[PDB]
Amino acid sequence: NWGAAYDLYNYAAPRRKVPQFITLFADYTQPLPNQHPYGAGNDPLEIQFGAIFKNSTINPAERAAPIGKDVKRILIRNGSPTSNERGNPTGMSEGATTLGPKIFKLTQNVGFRSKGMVQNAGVVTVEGSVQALITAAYQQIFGRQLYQGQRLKVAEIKLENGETTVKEFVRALGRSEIFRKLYWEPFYVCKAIEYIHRRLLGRPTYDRVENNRYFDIASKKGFYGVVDAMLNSNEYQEVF
Amino acid sequence: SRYFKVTACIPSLKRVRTGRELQNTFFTKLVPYENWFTEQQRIQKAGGKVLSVKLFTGVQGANTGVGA
Amino acid sequence: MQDAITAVINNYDVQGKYLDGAALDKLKAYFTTGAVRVRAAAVISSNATTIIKEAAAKALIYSDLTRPGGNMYTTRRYAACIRDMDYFLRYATYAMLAGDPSILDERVLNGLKETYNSLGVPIAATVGGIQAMKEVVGGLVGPDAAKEASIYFDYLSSGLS
Amino acid sequence: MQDAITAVINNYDVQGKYLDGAALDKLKAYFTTGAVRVRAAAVISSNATTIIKEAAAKALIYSDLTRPGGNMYTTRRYAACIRDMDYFLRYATYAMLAGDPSILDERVLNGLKETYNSLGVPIAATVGGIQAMKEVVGGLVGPDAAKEASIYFDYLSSGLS
Amino acid sequence: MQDAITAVINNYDVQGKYLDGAALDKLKAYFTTGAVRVRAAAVISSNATTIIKEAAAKALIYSDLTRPGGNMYTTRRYAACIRDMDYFLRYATYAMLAGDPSILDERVLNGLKETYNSLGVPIAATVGGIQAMKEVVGGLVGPDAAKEASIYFDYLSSGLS
Amino acid sequence: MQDAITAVINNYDVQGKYLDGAALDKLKAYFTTGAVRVRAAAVISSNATTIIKEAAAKALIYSDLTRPGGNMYTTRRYAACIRDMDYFLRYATYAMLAGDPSILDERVLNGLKETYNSLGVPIAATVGGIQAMKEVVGGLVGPDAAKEASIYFDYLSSGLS
Amino acid sequence: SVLTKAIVNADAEARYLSPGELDRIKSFVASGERRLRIAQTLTEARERIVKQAGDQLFQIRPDVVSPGGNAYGEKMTALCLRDLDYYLRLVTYGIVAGDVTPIEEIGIIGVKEMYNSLQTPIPAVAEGVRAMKNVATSLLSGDDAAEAGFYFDYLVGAMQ
Amino acid sequence: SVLTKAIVNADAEARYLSPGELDRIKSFVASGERRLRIAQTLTEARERIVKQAGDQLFQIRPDVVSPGGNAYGEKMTALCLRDLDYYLRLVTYGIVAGDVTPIEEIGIIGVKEMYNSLQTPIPAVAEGVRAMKNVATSLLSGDDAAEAGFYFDYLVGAMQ
Amino acid sequence: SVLTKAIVNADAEARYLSPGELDRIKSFVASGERRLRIAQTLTEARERIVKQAGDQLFQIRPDVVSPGGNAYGEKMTALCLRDLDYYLRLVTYGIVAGDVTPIEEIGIIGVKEMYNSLQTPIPAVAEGVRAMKNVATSLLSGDDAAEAGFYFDYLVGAMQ
Amino acid sequence: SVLTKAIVNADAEARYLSPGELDRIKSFVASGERRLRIAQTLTEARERIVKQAGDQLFQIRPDVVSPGGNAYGEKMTALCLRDLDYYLRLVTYGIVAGDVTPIEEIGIIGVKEMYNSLQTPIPAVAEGVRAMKNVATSLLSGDDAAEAGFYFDYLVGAMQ
Numbered sequence A: 001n002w003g004a005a006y007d008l009y010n011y012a013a014p015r016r017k018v019p020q021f022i023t024l025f026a027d028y029t030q031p032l033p034n035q036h037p038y039g040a041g042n043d044p045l046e047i048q049f050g051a052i053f054k055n056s057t058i059n060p061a062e063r064a065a066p067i068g069k070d071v072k073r074i075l076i077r078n079g080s081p082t083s084n085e086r087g088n089p090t091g092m093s094e095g096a097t098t099l100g101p102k103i104f105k106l107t108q109n110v111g112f113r114s115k116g117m118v119q120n121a122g123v124v125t126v127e128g129s130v131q132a133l134i135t136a137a138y139q140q141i142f143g144r145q146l147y148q149g150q151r152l153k154v155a156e157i158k159l160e161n162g163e164t165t166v167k168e169f170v171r172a173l174g175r176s177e178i179f180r181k182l183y184w185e186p187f188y189v190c191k192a193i194e195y196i197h198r199r200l201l202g203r204p205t206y207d208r209v210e211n212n213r214y215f216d217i218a219s220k221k222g223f224y225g226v227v228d229a230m231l232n233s234n235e236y237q238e239v240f
Numbered sequence B: 001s002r003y004f005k006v007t008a009c010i011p012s013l014k015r016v017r018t019g020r021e022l023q024n025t026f027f028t029k030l031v032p033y034e035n036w037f038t039e040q041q042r043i044q045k046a047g048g049k050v051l052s053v054k055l056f057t058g059v060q061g062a063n064t065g066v067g068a
Numbered sequence C, D, E, F: 001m002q003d004a005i006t007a008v009i010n011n012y013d014v015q016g017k018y019l020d021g022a023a024l025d026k027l028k029a030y031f032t033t034g035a036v037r038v039r040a041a042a043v044i045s046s047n048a049t050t051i052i053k054e055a056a057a058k059a060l061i062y063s064d065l066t067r068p069g070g071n072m073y074t075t076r077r078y079a080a081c082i083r084d085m086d087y088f089l090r091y092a093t094y095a096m097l098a099g100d101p102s103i104l105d106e107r108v109l110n111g112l113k114e115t116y117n118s119l120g121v122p123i124a125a126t127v128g129g130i131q132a133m134k135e136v137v138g139g140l141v142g143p144d145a146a147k148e149a150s151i152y153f154d155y156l157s158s159g160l161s
Numbered sequence G, H, I, J: 001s002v003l004t005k006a007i008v009n010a011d012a013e014a015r016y017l018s019p020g021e022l023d024r025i026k027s028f029v030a031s032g033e034r035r036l037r038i039a040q041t042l043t044e045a046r047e048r049i050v051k052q053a054g055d056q057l058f059q060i061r062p063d064v065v066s067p068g069g070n071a072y073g074e075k076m077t078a079l080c081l082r083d084l085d086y087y088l089r090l091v092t093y094g095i096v097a098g099d100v101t102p103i104e105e106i107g108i109i110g111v112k113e114m115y116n117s118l119q120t121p122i123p124a125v126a127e128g129v130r131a132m133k134n135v136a137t138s139l140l141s142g143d144d145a146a147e148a149g150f151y152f153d154y155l156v157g158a159m160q
């Protein structure tokens, strides 16, 4: 108990409220807990738009575990249990049940089709599904709607006009200045990667290999290298 | 900052989708220069056909002013 | 898209006029045939599979299409062809219920001709299948909605051709 | 997008030439008018919404465009037209700062003409609005940067026309 | 993050107080040493890889870290250790430019210790490497910015320890 | 902990070297200044409460810190702040006597920034108080030991900030 | 309309309407005569409602008719009354159509950008719409009053 | 500030600072003394500037001090003057900082939402800021007047 | 250039230029004459700088002109001197531009791939550029020498 | 149910409920007594329905109750009738809830895997469900018969 005991011997010992020795002696005789491959404070709170990331200085509750490199995390399927993708290699392509979240797919034409209707026709009915998809894209990428000045125009304009598809609009949102300002600037580097992974792809990271692939890109190209590498994965094209 | 005007047709053979895949199979879209490689390779590996490609944003031989 | 009511409403919107007697009798003309449209749509929905099967038997299968080298050859291509058949039938039902082919123009016909040209699908054979669907549907629904059903099938065939 | 200096650099690099007296003179000609561009750009940024309001009042509104049947009719079309207006103003300011209409060609004019043609937007009305911002901005900025501001608005109007 | 100027501005905004003589004196104290920080940052930016190479030679390599059983053994771990070293150097340069370790708190030290505990990395060896880069940078920059550079390396070492 | 002599001897032991002329000259410099540090430490020990006296009166009290909502509000927090300030003074005295910041790093600086972040203590206010006692100590000790005393207070302030 | 919404939902799901949409349609149709009657009543009383709503709005917001106001002057007041007439026509369209698609497209999407560019008080637009709601509800029986007040309340909420 | 903006831009690309950023930092540190002098000059006369800008704004837009106005009443006028003083303090902070980074987070992002919730005229607040700019530039030399006016119409453009 | 970097950020935020950005552009246009003088001096002393850097570089590490060296041969060394001239031209371009974007678009992006394919020593090229830095600094005043040295050691860091 | 579907869609869109969604909620709450009456009828006639479904099922597919059959033996037929009772219960739940959500969560998702593991004829179970549909529709009026037949048909289709 070298590391645990020398934390207790320090004069910051009373500032730690989470018990450490009973947890440590229990960890020695049990399998690996499931958390981030890095420290246990590296996985953010799973709320709509928080990105909490407990500080490890405001109130130390540091918890480590030798995770290695080939340990593949166990994730719960937010939907039908038999589509976990670990016992069903093609599970994201079979149906969509009521057990999971609503899936937005811009099947409406968009395109600015026009018609054999009035030249300056007032109603035109459904162009509120493009508007419905636009406000839903923010709800996924940022977790909430932005303020008035922060909304990215001249990409929603292209999406409405049909010049670009949803995959290109999502790329414009993810590579935006506001997304970097919110979820890249004020966070530790490996925390920002883990949170951005959940926003751009619907799941947390699986492996130390998966985390390191984005880490060694962030150290060479920065935020744009991470976001571009995430959006250009085979998994994104296969699933979404 | 260059873009690409790309028209492509992607047929999905083994899936058989139940509802409205005109907008997914055949489409024209704008793509940035730095992502045209990945987008083209995505189209090729799915058996799609790249009907047309246009520059639409840049100049043919710019040494400068083409920064991302 | 639009329906009859929305078409009248926006046609008066473009002039900035309140609803007048002319829009009134167009709306009444749409309203008076509501029940027949509903009954024919219910019949078509209940007999959707049989109509497609009969149309395919009458116009497509037992030909060079189902043989090797035919566009309808192989299970994948045949299932795709019958899915297109179901597409045409369902969107014809929607257009008939709404009383306007704008939904057919927007969600069906746009780009379909060029897509079929690129894929190699036979447009003439598809039009023949659509017409077989129209004959079977006119037989099933009866005189009350036969013309109302057939007009949108003719619209689809004209747009494809 | 390129500035005057970047344009000169590219023009000399494509021929593989170092900077000579002519390129230095061109760069000096750009440098001598830098401050006036910054001042006029600051004034335009400060008075952006008033310029658009006055231009719309002088060119578009109080006509059939805002009435029923008008292209700018309805809140959605009016909002889109004014957004296009402020886009034109902002990119005109960028082009005037950079001393080069390359950004105007690259990020506004590409696709705008056929987009307007497909949507039925009045090109003559748009050109009139851009001109209205032209004399409004010329009045605001003063003699120093009036012509330099006006050349890029004329560039936008000529590209649209 | 925050620099000296932003830190003073926030400390006065939280009180809702206009800037007084003490705040002006603090800002002047930062201003009088601005140029030396820029010169030192340019020096480290120019000689980045040499600093890492000398630090590794002085403190890390030719030891049991690079032999079998060491944490720096194998090409993967060697690359990881040098990339960590580069991260420390770059953020030390940022902190020295900004005059405030808040960037080091926010983007480096937060959770680094617990990550190293999970990975098994030797914190003592990491501290030794950080100090080695410290003396190398102190030799390169000179008396003018030696202490100013050294304070942030000491801050990183104390945060890790 | 370590001081000048122990640091030098261990630095030569780790190499395996005899104490050469440079090491004896560093011990020259340390030993020639010895009595000044001793008298400065005696003065600080004799005037410790009054140094905290003027430091608090010039940096902390009569501000928003002591009013309700402040951190140093209430008798408990006031006593804790003065005990901390005395801790800083005493450990600065130890560092000045030893001629090394190792004791300050080992027994004060570690856990301090994290504890203050945990409890909400204003680090800027703490640095101001440390600078206050630095000024007071410089006034008391005089020319002989002013700089030698002030260097460790500056080290503590830089480590906290 | 209800037919348009049901059709678009069934198309997006890729299925037929089933008894569900079938009967909801056989009803969006039974209430047609009552909706037409309510629309006819509002159209006949269009002038009175607009004038009374303008009068009541100028009582709660006197500053709009004032030197620093959007609607200062006879012609600017006429423009405000024309706007109120436009919104009354849109409410009649919504009542006849059975939903709020025409109202939302015609005069809601971008109305904020509208009145921000024009420097117009949108809360005063909302107060005018409320005044029109009260005046219109004063001319209708209870059930039809609630039916029209639903659309007026939707307009008031969406203009926020 | 300038340092924060340059450092964040460099960190986004994961690279050390470019020569242009170092040059702009040198220009900023050179102009720092003048910037702090201008800030102290504005701070010394904060009450006169606020009072004169308030009287100018109320003369320009009397409707806000009208019965139906948002700033009707002694307390309401006091709150408007306090907001003007807030923006003057923000302008001084921006002048010393050399960039708009701190004032942007302090008082412009979400300002539209707060003023819409408070039902206030944003163009009226902008006119008040312009009046404050005029009163401030009346107390400064020409170059320093332009330097302060840059941040002033930055606030004016932001509140739009 | 500085204008390009500022305008890219302004377009990314969809906003006009910030006051810090206008101040930076003003300072850059003020420094333009000095930058032009420095570029003119380097362009005039081009060939002498290249020659001195060339015979300076082969003294620190003569192995590159050895039998197992990349630059072994008269034409091989002529190519290396041509590369040094190319980088001097790029430095002169960047000096006038005020930033490093045109230098990056021409000589830095994907520079570690072509040199890896040619199997040339990138650290050797860095020292070669450093020699050019000393030779160029020898012909300039102190301030202009530091100004050119900024771009030179920027290139040295870039090839690294 | 319909409320869960509408609220889920509105929440996922981050919006208040549309008037069309409110109208469908009103229709669902209006039809509540009729749906409850249909559920009461089926629940009271549950045992006869299951027995007759078993009789026509064993008549139509006698191989199922045969020596190499999944449900040969008295307890294996008891389990088959118990499964039929389970599906009738889920159909009543679906009728009361107004949609197919409870049926999908409780007895359709993974039914293919479960019945493949148990080695039971899924087409046989579908035929049994159809027999239950016939027996149930013979005990109801026409509108109620169609309303229950919709859920029975969905069950048969989903078991495919």
Ligand SMILES: *C[C@@H](*)[C@H]1/C(=C/c2[nH]c(/C=C3N=C(/C=C4\NC(=O)C(CC)=C4C)C(C)=C\3CCC(=O)O)c(CCC(=O)O)c2C)NC(=O)[C@@H]1C
Residues within 6 Å of the ligand: C061, C062, C063, C066, C067, C073, C074, C075
């Ligand atoms: C053992 C025979 C079983 C059987 C079969 C049956 N098939 C048909 C008709 C068709 N079968 C096909 C099949 C294919 N098309 C393909 O591309 C492939 C992949 C190579 C296959 C397998 C087709 C296309 C038809 C339609 C006619 C045609 O070929 O043109 C029929 C006739 C049905 C009818 O309604 O006429 C039968 C009876 N029936 C049994 O009972 C056996 C188990």
Ligand SMILES: *C[C@@H](*)[C@H]1/C(=C/c2[nH]c(/C=C3N=C(/C=C4\NC(=O)C(CC)=C4C)C(C)=C\3CCC(=O)O)c(CCC(=O)O)c2C)NC(=O)[C@@H]1C
Residues within 6 Å of the ligand: H064, H070, H071, H076, H079, H080, H081, H083, H084, H086, H087, H106, H107, H118, H120, H121, H122, H124, H125, H128
């Ligand atoms: C010239 C005055 C204009 C005006 C203003 C007005 N403001 C309020 C109320 C508030 N204003 C604020 C402002 C801020 N909070 C911040 O953090 C900042 C950034 C520094 C600002 C600017 C706040 C918080 C309030 C609420 C009350 C409070 O401060 O606790 C009001 C009162 C509105 C009400 O409903 O009571 C007014 C009138 N009104 C005008 O007409 C002028 C244009």
Ligand SMILES: *[C@H](C)[C@H]1/C(=C/c2[nH]c(/C=C3N=C(/C=C4\NC(=O)C(CC)=C4C)C(C)=C\3CCC(=O)O)c(CCC(=O)O)c2C)NC(=O)[C@@H]1C
Residues within 6 Å of the ligand: A073, A074, A075, A076, A077, A080, A081, A082, A083, A084, A086
């Ligand atoms: C079966 C004998 C027992 C039982 C199991 C049960 N499990 C779940 C759900 C999940 N089971 C897993 C398991 C794993 N994922 C992995 O990667 C691994 C390592 C190979 C395992 C073991 C997971 C992750 C889930 C949840 C996510 C998913 O479905 O994929 C359920 C369903 C729970 C539910 O209804 O939500 C059940 C029933 N239940 C018993 O009674 C048996 C004793």
Ligand SMILES: *[C@H](C)[C@H]1/C(=C/c2[nH]c(/C=C3N=C(/C=C4\NC(=O)C(CC)=C4C)C(C)=C\3CCC(=O)O)c(CCC(=O)O)c2C)NC(=O)[C@@H]1C
Residues within 6 Å of the ligand: B010, B011, B012, B013, B016, B017, B019, B020, B021, B022, B023, B024, B025, B026, C060, C065, C071, C072, C073, C076, C077, C078, C080, C081, C082, C084, C085, C087, C107, C108, C115, C119, C121, C122, C125, C126, C129
């Ligand atoms: C059937 C009567 C004829 C026929 C058809 C056929 N079609 C395809 C493939 C496609 N059909 C579609 C149709 C649509 N996509 C949409 O978005 C919509 C909106 C409802 C429609 C109508 C498209 C785009 C495809 C390609 C992608 C896909 O397969 O889903 C095929 C298969 C072609 C292939 O092998 O790639 C066939 C055979 N064939 C005949 O012989 C008939 C005349």
Ligand SMILES: *[C@H](C)[C@H]1/C(=C/c2[nH]c(/C=C3N=C(/C=C4\NC(=O)C(CC)=C4C)C(C)=C\3CCC(=O)O)c(CCC(=O)O)c2C)NC(=O)[C@@H]1C
Residues within 6 Å of the ligand: A154, A157, A158, A160, A161, D060, D065, D071, D072, D073, D076, D077, D078, D080, D081, D082, D084, D085, D087, D088, D107, D108, D112, D115, D119, D121, D122, D125, D126, D129
């Ligand atoms: C305004 C002066 C005139 C006018 C305009 C109008 N425009 C649209 C629609 C669009 N306008 C754009 C514009 C741009 N996209 C860009 O990228 C840029 C530069 C960065 C510009 C200027 C586009 C792409 C569209 C299509 C998408 C959209 O509608 O937002 C409309 C709407 C047409 C409609 O209702 O479908 C209008 C009305 N109309 C006038 O009357 C003015 C003369």
Ligand SMILES: *[C@H](C)[C@H]1/C(=C/c2[nH]c(/C=C3N=C(/C=C4\NC(=O)C(CC)=C4C)C(C)=C\3CCC(=O)O)c(CCC(=O)O)c2C)NC(=O)[C@@H]1C
Residues within 6 Å of the ligand: A188, A189, A190, A191, A208, A209, A211, A212, A215, E060, E065, E071, E072, E076, E077, E078, E080, E081, E082, E084, E085, E087, E107, E108, E112, E115, E119, E121, E122, E125, E126, E129
């Ligand atoms: C190098 C001097 C020492 C050393 C280091 C070492 N590190 C790793 C692995 C990682 N290092 C990091 C570092 C960071 N993440 C951050 O966000 C920051 C702040 C910018 C840092 C510094 C991380 C996240 C990893 C994990 C990478 C992964 O997931 O694979 C290793 C590799 C360990 C392994 O098991 O492969 C090593 C060796 N080792 C020494 O001996 C030196 C003292």
Ligand SMILES: *[C@H](C)[C@H]1/C(=C/c2[nH]c(/C=C3N=C(/C=C4\NC(=O)C(CC)=C4C)C(C)=C\3CCC(=O)O)c(CCC(=O)O)c2C)NC(=O)[C@@H]1C
Residues within 6 Å of the ligand: F061, F062, F063, F066, F067, F072, F073, F074, F075, F078
């Ligand atoms: C008054 C009857 C006696 C007296 C008092 C006196 N007090 C001060 C200064 C301070 N007193 C306090 C007190 C408190 N802080 C707390 O948190 C609490 C608990 C609620 C108390 C009581 C503080 C903080 C100060 C310092 C200034 C400040 O508040 O910021 C003085 C001034 C001392 C000086 O200026 O040196 C005096 C004189 N003096 C008498 O003669 C009475 C017996």
Ligand SMILES: *[C@H](C)[C@H]1/C(=C/c2[nH]c(/C=C3N=C(/C=C4\NC(=O)C(CC)=C4C)C(C)=C\3CCC(=O)O)c(CCC(=O)O)c2C)NC(=O)[C@@H]1C
Residues within 6 Å of the ligand: A011, F060, F065, F071, F072, F076, F077, F078, F080, F081, F082, F084, F085, F087, F107, F108, F112, F115, F119, F121, F122, F125, F126, F129
């Ligand atoms: C005083 C100028 C500032 C201030 C201080 C403050 N500190 C505490 C509490 C503690 N301070 C310490 C400090 C140390 N313990 C050590 O061993 C050392 C080094 C040898 C130090 C520096 C500790 C451990 C505590 C917590 C336990 C304790 O209270 O003794 C407080 C009290 C906080 C509370 O109420 O919980 C305060 C107020 N506050 C200010 O405002 C000044 C800037």
Ligand SMILES: CCC1=C(C)/C(=C/C2=NC(=C\c3[nH]c(/C=C4\NC(=O)[C@H](C)[C@H]4CC)c(C)c3CCC(=O)O)/C(CCC(=O)O)=C2C)NC1=O
Residues within 6 Å of the ligand: D061, D062, D063, D066, D067, D073, D074, D075, G057, G064, G070, G071, G076, G079, G080, G083, G086, G087, G106, G107, G118, G120, G121, G122, G123, G124, G125, G126, G128
């Ligand atoms: C059917 C959709 C639709 C609407 C609504 C519409 C409105 C509309 N309102 C206008 C003006 C105006 N609208 C208002 C409104 C108000 N002032 C206040 O104090 C209140 C907040 C509010 C009244 C309750 C004012 C004051 C003006 C005049 C603005 C000006 O003259 O600058 C104008 C500009 C002049 C013109 O009509 O040509 C339009 C187009 N146009 C459309 O196509």
